[PDB]
Amino acid sequence: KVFGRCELAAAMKRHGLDNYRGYSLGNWVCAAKFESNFNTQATNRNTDGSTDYGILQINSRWWCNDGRTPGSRNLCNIPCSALLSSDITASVNCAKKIVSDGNGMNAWVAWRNRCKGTDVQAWIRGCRL
Numbered sequence: 001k002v003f004g005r006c007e008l009a010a011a012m013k014r015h016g017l018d019n020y021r022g023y024s025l026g027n028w029v030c031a032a033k034f035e036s037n038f039n040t041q042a043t044n045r046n047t048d049g050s051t052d053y054g055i056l057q058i059n060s061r062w063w064c065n066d067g068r069t070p071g072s073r074n075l076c077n078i079p080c081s082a083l084l085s086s087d088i089t090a091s092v093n094c095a096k097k098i099v100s101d102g103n104g105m106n107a108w109v110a111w112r113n114r115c116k117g118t119d120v121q122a123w124i125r126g127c128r129l
Contacts, residue, residue, distance in 0.1 A: 001086035003040070004038070008029055011088055015089065030111065031056060040083075040084055042054060064079065
């Protein structure tokens, strides 16, 4: 499922992401935009053999099990395929664990390079939240 900007904002808000660990809703929507272009089915292979899954491009080396990343930890206790679902619950729950890890949203490269320090409030403009 490819989410609309405001549709995703509302879904993330309902799932408790607005201001989670101090990150306003705009940050999460911006991250999703640049990580997967709002597509829940996005997957990307990394040079180290691990794969990024879903709306927030969560990595298989540490967070989910995809059966093909040797020596990986499954910290979110879920199969990576669960992260490609149209229901973002699994992605959100796992994202919460990642952002609490210590590096905050810096864990998401696209966020660090394209959202951090920008007017993230623009990502939720016009939305009925």
